[PDB]
């Protein structure tokens, strides 16, 4: 892996070091703290806060009750239609590895070595230049393969 970021402070907002062409991997290794209610990994168009930057792909594990992963897109400061995956691998106090693979038509995401979900593109992935990680999460490394 390339352009590896170690132990970033959260919230993390960083420029992705190359375009997200088909076959690109984003690999994120981390841990969920015991007090976590949710965290998110956002692939964004820029880093503006006011107005809020468009989020092509919001990947949002939530830990209340049996948990879930909520995926969505933010356009013009407005959330679209949620795609919720209830078969969630994440747990409070457990370590994880997320692999986001960018394909022509969709994102393909594996967690802890097992296929987890697909998310069809809503914003062209060529519009993505920024990776954001927010919420209650401990990140050990972020790595890229272009």
Ligand X SMILES: *O[C@H]1[C@@H](O)[C@@H](CO)O[C@@H](O[C@H]2[C@H](O)[C@@H](O)[C@H](O)O[C@@H]2CO)[C@@H]1O
Q: Based on CB atoms, which residue is closest to ligand X, 73 or 116?
A: 73
Q: Does 75 bind ligand X (CB under 6 A)?
A: no
Neighbours of 110 (CB within 10 A): 17
φ, ψ for residue 20, nearest 5 deg: -90, 70
Question: Binding string, 51-70, against ligand X, x = CB under 6 A?
Answer: -------x-x---------x
Q: Does 72 bind ligand X (CB under 6 A)?
A: yes
The residue nearest ligand X at its CB is 72
Binding site annotation covers 72? yes
Q: Based on CB atoms, which residue is closest to ligand X, 1 or 79?
A: 79
Q: Write down the residue that tokens 């802890």 correspond to.
A: 112
Strand runs labelled E in 1-146: 2-6, 12-15, 25-31, 39-45, 54-62, 68-75, 78-79, 83-85, 95-102, 106-111, 114-120, 130-135, 138-145
Which structure tokens are listed for 146? 């272009």
Q: Based on CB atoms, which residue is closest to ligand X, 66 or 104?
A: 66
The burial of 92, by beta-carbon neighbours within 10 Å (0-12 exposed, 13-18 middle, 19 or more buried), is given as middle
Q: Does 79 bind ligand X (CB under 6 A)?
A: yes
Q: How far is the CB of 23 from ligand X (least distance, A)?
A: 27
Provide CB contacts within 8 A for 48, sequence distance 6+: none
Q: Does 82 bind ligand X (CB under 6 A)?
A: yes
Q: Based on CB atoms, which residue is closest to ligand X, 137 or 144?
A: 137
Q: Which residues bind ligand X (CB under 6 A)?
A: 58, 60, 70, 72, 79, 82
**Which residues contribute to the annotated binding site for a carbohydrate?**
62, 72, 82
């Amino acid at each position: 892996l390339q352009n590896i970021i170690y132990n970033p402070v959260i919230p993390f907002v960083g420029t992705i070091p190359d375009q997200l062409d088909p076959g690109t991997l984003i690999v994120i290794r981390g841990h969920v703290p015991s007090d976590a209610d949710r965290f998110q990994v956002d692939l964004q168009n820029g880093s503006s806060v006011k107005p809020r930057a468009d989020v092509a792909f919001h990947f949002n594990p939530r830990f209340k009750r049996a948990g879930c992963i909520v995926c969505n897109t933010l356009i013009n400061e407005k959330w679209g239609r949620e795609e919720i995956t209830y078969d969630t691998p994440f747990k409070r106090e457990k370590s994880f590895e997320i692999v986001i693979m960018v394909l022509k038509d969709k994102f393909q995401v594996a967690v802890n070595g097992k296929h987890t979900l697909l998310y069809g593109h809503r914003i062209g992935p060529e519009k993505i230049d920024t990776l954001g990680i927010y919420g209650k999460v401990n990140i050990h490394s972020i790595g890229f393969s272009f």
